Amino acid sequence: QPFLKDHRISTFKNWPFLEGCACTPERMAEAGFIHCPTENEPDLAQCFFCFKELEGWEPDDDPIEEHKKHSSGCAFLSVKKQFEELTLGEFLKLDRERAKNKIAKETNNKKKEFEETAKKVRRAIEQLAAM
């Protein structure tokens, strides 16, 4: 479903950078991107495949260029065929890589939230250490 450029392109119905820019909904959706606007970062877009999240876009940001630059190890980036031209096998291996990519982003978020808490814990324990 998200593998379809057209499921993706439909998420940008309120995306700022339109015709005239480089990160147009089309060049974005074609680069694996999906529009995930939060109240504070309304231009936040996320790769449907590697789940990296990029904000603060700029009129001449190349969705593909930014993609390679921040998530170089993304498999979707290396797919050179059109979608319909993927073997069922290729599509399975792609979809399995994706599940692995979702497990990874989640782990990162779990570890990140954990370190944020631990630092706050370590710091309060230092205070005691002094006395």
Partner: peptide, 4 residues
């Protein structure tokens, strides 16, 4: 763009 930058990392969120």
């Amino acid at each position: 763009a930058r990392t969120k």
